[model samples]
Target: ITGTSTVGVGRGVLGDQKNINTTYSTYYYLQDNTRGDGIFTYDAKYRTTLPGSLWADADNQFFASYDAPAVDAHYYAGVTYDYYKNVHNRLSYDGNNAAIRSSVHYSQGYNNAFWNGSEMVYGDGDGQTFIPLSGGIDVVAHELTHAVTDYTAGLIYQNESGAINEAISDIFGTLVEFYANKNPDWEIGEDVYTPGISGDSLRSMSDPAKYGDPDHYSKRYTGTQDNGGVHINSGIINKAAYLISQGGTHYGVSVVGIGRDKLGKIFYRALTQYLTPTSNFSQLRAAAVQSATDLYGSTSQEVASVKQAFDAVGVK
Candidate 1:
């Protein structure tokens, strides 16, 4: 579908307007050549098959009601790509520029989205639960960051390493949201999480306890479900990340906020240079401390704050 890069204006699942990339020949198709290798969107058509048909339009406009999910998936995938390239200096998911692919309208009333080890997939939620997951930029960035973790740290998908992996995605996903400057908050999936519930999110980094997630290491679940409580235990790391970016006090310990940019730099360095597939919470603590020390001096507040955040979360 590569010929000349073109832009198409459309509304998302949430009825928000934005421009998306497409390829132009006699018609415009949902294939972009402007970013990385390319950005492609497909139609899942309520089926579970992988990578459905390439979305195409005759007039090069995509304002139809049904085109909303495709619009957001394509557009947000580009945004996530730009976030990695522009903010982190990493090209696409891999260090090398890799093409991004997304499929929308995945199954009837599906309520989640995922990376599936390679490309991205979205569900047009059960309406009450979610609209179309692609409508949330944070969700899109979160999924893309999983691919980043896979390429860089190769963190195992279970236990402490898996929790760290999930937390990294949440961390970067929130960073990307702030980078976009669109109603940014530390709450994950707030924009498209629940249509009926306001001020609620799938997860809350600022206060993981609000959603019954463990903000302390002692509260971590050792159960076998959810890949050794990967999603559940991530709250501890997410809380630590939130405190790093915006300082807070917990259990009589106080942390000085180092702001988001430095937090991102420190974690990015740790993920790329220090972390391994089997790294645990203690190892993660060492990685972050070293990362902060690498960026700032060993005696700097950045390093201290990293240590403080981990300690506050009871990560030891």
Candidate 2:
């Protein structure tokens, strides 16, 4: 309710301690005014509500057991905002200073998170499957990147375009994780996924095939489920992205590593300028090639690696 920025300490869902930018007046509220426009986090109180109450603490201090998800949600949102502005030179998701909003503890045992067009919503998982989804920085960045996609490519949420949408989210999410340098890995949601099991994740960009996802175009799911396999078919693009960044051979196809920064530069350019609502895998290849050419000359190895990466995934 206040209009000033303050600092507060709290533990994340995984029991890691961190400080967050908050607001103060009536009660200590989770809001940061320093990042671009602003970032505000709220508590859903285990309800299926949108942007619930501005999380209020008795004081500015957040104890672990009681306020884990809230802390992560607020802190991660700031990190994501920083990532986009610092890396892409984009002010916010809209290329304008847009206020970021998020809600945590949404519904009891809800094992998912999403961007509902306007804001981010995170579920406190059933514990066995997931803990607090916001606890995973990759997941948090993934959702925020959706808002970025919504503003930029406006990709159709079905079939190949939808898969592109998901892949873009996964791609930037991984980039943000690596950008933060926190136990960075190509696996998504590994930090908060499966408390009982270790070394398992919701998805893997390095090896999508490990989780029954197709790493090549031949294995792409062409079904109606999941909005034409938006999540399933995304593995193809994810694999291509991974290979472009890390360099690897799969099924006799090899890609020279171009490193993560170059990969992000190429993809971000394509997403913001070349991609469209209905762009498919073939179109993505063209977009990436053009983006690479624009960034590093038509004959540069960056352009070659983009072509090789797409070829390795059989995206034409």
What lDDT would candidate 2 get against the real structure? Answer: 0.92
TM-scores of the candidates are: 0.98, 0.98
- Summing lDDT over every window of 10 consecutive residues in candidate 1, give the lowest-scoring window: 1-10
Model 2: per-residue Cα lDDT over 1-316, one tens digit each: 5566789898888788898988888788888888877888888888997788988887898885759888998898888889988999999899888999999889899999999999999999998999989999999999999999999999999999999999999999999999999899999999999999989999999999899999999999987999999999999999999999999887788889999999999999999999999999999999999999999999998998889888899989
Q: What is the C-alpha lDDT of each candidate?
A: 0.91, 0.92
Kindly report which residue stretches of model 2 are placed more than 4 angstroms away from their true locations once superposed. none
Clashes of each: 0, 0
